Symmetry: C4
Subunit: 400 residues, 4 copies
């Protein structure tokens, strides 16, 4: 979109002015050579203040917002330079630099999504500090005694001084020699201390948030381990729990499915649940013929559970009541004595369907081959769901 290109162009124009205005205040002879750009740049500025009125909600000129735009659109710089009027009034040429805050707001709004906000604020602060350093170096030159030194070396020395002061390094090889330079130095010292404190605070804020997920996982694991140590839990079970948390981190950054899915609204939660359990519940022979309404109601009630390697999901002879769907990993179905393996079931398969229709003991043992992500449906909830689908209840009773 060309409007963003216009905003980038105005970024360039305001940077042009932030560079040129103090550098022209210290070197008046620089005015006329760059005059054809100045009229070009100022025109662009007068082009902007009516433009964004068509985008602010895609005319509150009396509000504090849009005040720096119009205040910085006045051709004060041209008049000040042309009139060669005295410096104490010439300083009003800087009023155009108030466009900087509006340009910062625009850049923040057009980079508010691709860039971390803390990093965006840090980068904006760094750019502002570089521009302020340029301005402060120009002021330092303006207070320096006249000399035959080339303008480039003068600017280099002033920028060296201002960087030495703002960074608080303070070599002191360049120091104020006059009372006005001393007052200016005091002001710049306070400003540099504030700017460097802002830099440090922004960096601290940025870096304190980097490992949020990993630090949350670590605090969770330490809490659990300390509590289990208090309860005198044996180290084997503690090792199994530690490796469970290792699995949870390496697979899904320690996030709980139960808590993540609550952050979605019901239509999106239903879409996600239908996506994850794709055809796994619509391939079950118990309710192949069921309507999609019953399928949706079943899908919304599946509870995620993770079983570790070798953990028993079902033991033969237990008065079980739950059916399980394998979302990831694999399980072995074993005899009641576990001396022989009836089957291996893998991702996309299911077991325990008999518990939903009958109330009989479990036919065979089920044991996880490794870390299995499974979904559990309780017969209590299955009956609750059947309570509102009499046709499906009749179908399943006929099957039973």
């Amino acid at each position: 979109t060309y409007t963003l290109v216009w905003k980038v162009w105005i970024l360039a124009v305001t940077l042009y002015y932030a560079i040129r205005i103090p550098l022209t205040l210290v070197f008046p002879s620089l005015f006329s050579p760059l005059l054809p750009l100045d009229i070009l740049a100022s025109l662009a500025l007068i082009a902007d203040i009516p433009l964004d009125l068509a985008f602010e909600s895609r005319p509150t000129l009396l509000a504090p917002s849009r005040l720096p735009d119009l205040l910085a659109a006045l051709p004060l710089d041209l008049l000040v330079f042309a009139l060669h009027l005295p410096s104490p009034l010439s300083l009003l040429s800087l009023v155009r630099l108030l466009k900087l805050i509006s340009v910062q707001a625009s850049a923040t709004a057009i980079l508010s999504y691709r860039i971390n906000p803390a990093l965006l604020r840090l980068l904006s602060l760094v750019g502002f500090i570089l521009l302020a350093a340029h301005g402060i170096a120009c002021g330092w030159m303006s207070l320096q005694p006249p000399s035959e030194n080339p303008a480039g070396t003068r600017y280099l020395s002033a920028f060296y001084w201002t960087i030495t002061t703002l960074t608080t390094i303070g070599y002191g090889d360049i120091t104020p020699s006059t009372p006005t330079q001393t007052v200016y130095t005091i002001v710049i010292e306070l400003l540099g201390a504030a700017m460097y404190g802002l830099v440090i605070g922004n960096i601290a804020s940025l870096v304190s948030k980097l490992d949020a997920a990993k630090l949350l996982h670590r605090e969770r694991v330490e809490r659990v381990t300390a509590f289990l140590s208090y309860k005198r839990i044996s180290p084997e079970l503690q090792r199994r729990i530690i490796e469970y948390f290792d699995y949870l981190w390496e697979t899904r950054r320690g996030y709980e499915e139960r808590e993540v899915l609550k952050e979605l609204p019901h239509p999106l939660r239903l879409a996600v649940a239908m996506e994850i359990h794709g055809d796994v519940i619509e391939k079950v022979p118990l309710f192949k013929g069921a309507g999609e309404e019953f399928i949706r109601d079943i899908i919304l009630h599946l509870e995620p559970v993770i079983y570790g390697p070798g953990e028993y999901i079902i033991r033969a002879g237990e008065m079980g009541s739950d059916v399980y769907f394998i979302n990831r990993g694999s399980v072995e179905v074993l005899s009641a004595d576990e001396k022989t393996r009836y089957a291996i079931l893998s991702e996309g398969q299911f077991f325990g369907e008999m518990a939903l229709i009958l109330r009989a003991p479990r036919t065979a043992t089920v044991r996880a081959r490794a870390f299995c992500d499974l979904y559990r449906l309780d017969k209590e909830t299955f009956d609750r769901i059947l309570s509102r689908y009499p046709e499906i209840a009749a179908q399943i009773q006929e099957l039973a």
Copy 2:
């Protein structure tokens, strides 16, 4: 209220003393010219210590509170200056400056609401640092060898030194030349390091809290996106969820209605719910004649839900049971084959009323035109509510 103006006046008086007392300790000749203000200022102080006793709960003189007020109300400064007594005892003139902490407490209490507390602490620290810098410059002058330099240049040099030290820039063009100046320099170096660390910590605390809502939204979105990536969700559904979160941010800063309304007490929650659902439930033909008690009970149980563009709220033939109220956005009511559009419903309208009275299949499909903020009422909860209003139950049964 004039009491706040009195507190501002005492702010001015304590700033007057914090400036004058060390500057008089270094320039005794400054005493008499400002004497008519001093008696004016000290009187104001003796006017204060009985005054706030009428406001402290709107007389605990033995408590640590109100101790700095009375301790700083003693006319020690006048006696010390008048007696021209020796400097080691003259330093007791500074006891009046203990009013500063009480004035800071007062300013914090009268600006505790309009101003962010972290920013308020930062500003108080900055003011304290400026006053301390003035005092330290006065001490530096007090340890300097006598000279014919004008008092203004002496103060400027001392303030330059103390600012250079406190900001930790340390040019070193002004350095202690005597052992007493060296001890003073060491003390001031430690104090300046502590003050600048306090400044940096306050700035870091302030800036780490700026984007709390945006950072919470970002961490939520990253958690959800990472989890959906683990579940191998298709990118179309991920895009729909991302645009849902974009809508949630751009409309309501990512806040959950369900969680915001829990932070209000029941009377205020009821007032808010009655305000939002204004006449939308009192215009429904199903219960036009119902009493306001039933209306309130219904209003408290409406559940907010957001549907994205093109999402199906109701599909024809479904065994639906919920009525929906459109709080924002618009929906289209479509035929069972969706090849024709029966109607468009907008903000303030409702659909699905038949499900509450009957138990019949849905007559027509309902699909969101865009992001719709809707309120859902389940027939289970509607029946729960009807259980306590037999007259309304009879009315609705007669309608059915």
Copy 3:
């Protein structure tokens, strides 16, 4: 307890050694004058390593813990000073200073309750930095060329240099002149940068936690206000909600009773609930004769609710079901037309008792005079409680 006094004495002894050992390494002549204290101090140290074995669980000598104690109990300093052996081996005299970490652990454990842990860590760091500054000044003197300067001025200059370096101020009036002094300066510069970064981090951590309750209240209020602004809530209701939050802050720091009471175990929660509702439920005529078991069961189920000024708690003719207990504030009981006031009820009184026994409409309107802290008991929960006390149910039915 005298054991804490012993630990304070050993604090004094370890500070004595941390001062003396480097100062004796630079001034050997200081050894013999303080020898009678040294044997006194070292004896105290050899007295400690068997003592705390009786307190460590109120003998794991092979563990890393208690290793610095025994390692710092060896009389190495006495031998090094007496042998006047060469400096590269004389540096082993510093091994006694390893008592510092054990003394820091002891001080942290005996001040872990009266003092904020972050402030405790900051103070420990500051003390360690002062001791390290003393040691570094001694090293700087040890690398300085011999001179006739008095020892006091030499120490003052070295301490000035080390404070100037550690605080990163860096005047540079004292600088290394030799390669060994340059290497030492580099090491001390890195150490000072690390120490000052530690100071800044500790201060930032301390100050970022100061206003936790106030910042939580502010973020809550901003969230609620922003959400209500999105919902287009009228400014009058917003003002009422703002003043409700103001009341909540000024009374109880914004804490929710419902959430605070969940942080207590059941016996303590019951004790607190019995304390708050003291005789208010045991004075009700409905169940004066009830046993204390029923009283406890009733007391555990009272729900706190806050009503704002002028809010209607009960309106005449409503099909109400709740009884209310006034814990603070006062309410007015008014006629059905509100044109006359039947009564005013205050702290410790109750209203709405008829709703529990009968099912009749409310006899009169109840309206809050100001912010009232009330407790609500629902007839549904009252019936649940009566279900387990048949005698009390019979009593209340006889009353009805």
Copy 4:
């Protein structure tokens, strides 16, 4: 595993290059003496870029990942040194140093578990800063005027300058004398300010997280104490609650069992619950003969509760319904008048079994000897469990 040893070897090789390359750029004569190591080191690098392809998922050469590895595997350094080609093109020899970020990633991945991530980032930053300081000192030497000074003293002076600048101490005894040195100084000043801000931010982040559990406990206790102070709770009950929180901290760091056990999945939660309640529920005479299924169902529903010293768990004559299992601490069973002690029960014992079968009043009072960790089973939940085990219900009814 030898692969980790290979990664450590490549750590050594990349450190070798990061040291040698700039030091050879400033001292070309250093090239040939270390040439037999260079060919040895570069070979190792060309050995790596095919190796990790077998481990990246235990070949995406077009991705940004693995780009620095191949870019840093080119023998550019050998050619640049052998060709003695001009310095502006010789600077390309540094391209090999891009191996540093890959080595940092590898070290982070192989130390991501034993080391706190914040501390790991801080240590990596410190190492990077030391290497950068070496490089910057080499650049400073490269811009220095030729002199007869020994290379060691030149390097020492350059390293002194760069450490003085990066730490922001800034003595200023060594300062740029030429415009190119001034530009280099400005760049290094900005880089050092950024690096020191990074150090401070990392330290602040690290130290702000140290006392997370203790600070959470303190904020909990302050919240509870403030709320109880508002409710005008008597100081005796407040003292009992404070000592309860002291017990909770000293035993289990203030963690709630109810919340810790929710962070485990159902199989691990069941394993932990079976471990804690080991034989305590399988020794009860009420259900000695019960199957392990009923035992598991009972075990999952035990609620933890802590009773303070002297607190009454059961009072004689109460219409109680709960059985209690002593996990830690001890209780006394006392007569109805409490004038005699029937028994003392300790860890691993139980009381209140009669309430589960009968509905009779409590036979005797039970009072905690000290802080008791107990588990409560309610008859309501016991009946819920019995509802699914008819055989056990028949057994317990026969016992009753």
